[PDB]
């Protein structure tokens, strides 16, 4: 919602690495929701959530490509918050 402390981990298995979705646990967030990772007052990144019963409550797992963009480390504290898009100008048409 407004933001919570989370800990970066590694994607459980290679199955959820080809989805480009932030793998989480069912005890924290829910598959279908979007989030905005925060790492500094200037680096804001937006990912898609997908639950998986292996993530530890209070930690988000990312794949290398996601980690290869955001400069994220396996074992650091980050502030993650749900982020809801607006269906007016945020719907992709030509990318």
């Amino acid at each position: 919602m407004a933001g919570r402390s989370m800990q970066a981990a590694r994607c459980p298995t290679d199955e959820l690495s080809l989805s480009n979705c932030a793998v989480v646990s069912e005890k924290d967030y829910q598959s279908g929701q979007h989030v905005i990772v925060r790492t500094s007052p200037n680096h804001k990144y937006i990912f898609t959530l997908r639950t998986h019963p292996s993530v530890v409550p209070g930690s988000v797992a990312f794949s290398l490509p996601q980690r290869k963009w955001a400069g994220l480390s396996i074992g650091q504290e980050i502030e993650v918050a749900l982020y809801s898009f607006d269906k007016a100008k945020q719907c992709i048409g030509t990318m």
Binding site: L64, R67, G71, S73, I74, G75
Partner: protein, 286 residues
């Protein structure tokens, strides 16, 4: 010379006086003479290469010297009692120095408490191996050395913590220690060249990390990469990061194929080599 008669004439001479033996003043002249002679006696046994019997001769001298009132050199007699079984084979110098250090700090003092707490730590690392306690000894002792701006042992005993701790069990302590040394290493005009291997030790510890966290230290650190000795720190790393990240071994191993000639590899470096390639095994080995 007398290994026994100094004893026999002093054991009949050590007794508390509530009797006809009391008289006017105490027998503190008698136990003063006796403890000086026990000191000479523990000397003649150590001269006679009897470091167990000599060390126990220091133990009675060292414990009986407190009985008049002398906490000053009873600490020295404790260190001598420790040095004897430190030179001789077994333990129980550990108790001579644990009797020492507490009494030394009970004087109102800090330094030599740490300077023999490191001695116990060296024994419990090298000899009476209790590294999970010796590293705590380095840790608290380096806390004392930190609080006295004896920056030497303050950096040193921390390095002794982290160099074994990282490989065996503690991971965030590795970079936290090698960065705590590394900042004030960059500070002083004396220290900033020792920082090169310190940030090498911070970097090459990988903590089940596949990443360029070492490169985070690169674009952090004041390398001045036209200083090429840090290329044996990070261009080493700029190869092996993508060797480990592209799960490749004939470039990772090639790094030490060429680096063993241009730098002699000690046990800790090769154990860390084997550590990062255990991460390579966990990346590859099915």
């Amino acid at each position: 010379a007398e290994a026994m008669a100094l004893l026999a004439e002093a054991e009949r001479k050590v007794k508390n006086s509530q009797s006809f033996f009391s008289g006017l003043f105490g027998g503190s002249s008698k136990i003063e003479e006796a403890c000086e002679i026990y000191a000479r006696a523990a000397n003649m046994f150590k001269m006679a290469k009897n470091w167990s019997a000599a060390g126990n001769a220091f133990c009675q001298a060292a414990q009986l010297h407190l009985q008049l009132q002398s906490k000053h050199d009873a600490a020295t007699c404790f260190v001598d009692a420790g040095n004897a079984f430190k030179k001789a084979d077994p333990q129980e110098a550990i108790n001579c120095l644990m009797r020492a250090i507490e009494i030394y700090t009970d004087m109102g003092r800090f330094t030599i408490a740490a300077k023999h707490h490191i001695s116990i730590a060296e024994i419990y690392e090298t000899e009476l191996v209790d590294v999970e306690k010796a590293i705590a000894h380095y840790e608290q002792s380096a806390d004392y050395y930190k609080g006295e701006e004896s920056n030497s042992s303050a950096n040193k005993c921390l390095l002794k913590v982290a160099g074994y701790a990282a490989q065996l069990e503690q991971y965030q302590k590795a970079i936290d220690i090698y960065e705590q040394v590394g900042t004030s290493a960059m500070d002083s005009p004396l220290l900033k060249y020792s920082a090169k291997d310190y940030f090498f030790k911070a970097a090459l510890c990988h903590f089940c990390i596949d990443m360029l966290n070492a490169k985070l230290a690169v674009q952090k650190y004041e390398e001045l990469f036209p200083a090429f000795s840090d290329s044996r720190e990070c261009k080493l790393m700029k190869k092996l990061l993508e060797a480990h990240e592209e799960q490749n071994v004939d470039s990772y191993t090639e790094s030490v194929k060429e680096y063993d000639s241009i730098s002699r590899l000690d046990q800790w470096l090769t154990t860390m080599l084997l550590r990062i390639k255990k991460t390579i095994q966990g990346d590859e080995e099915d």
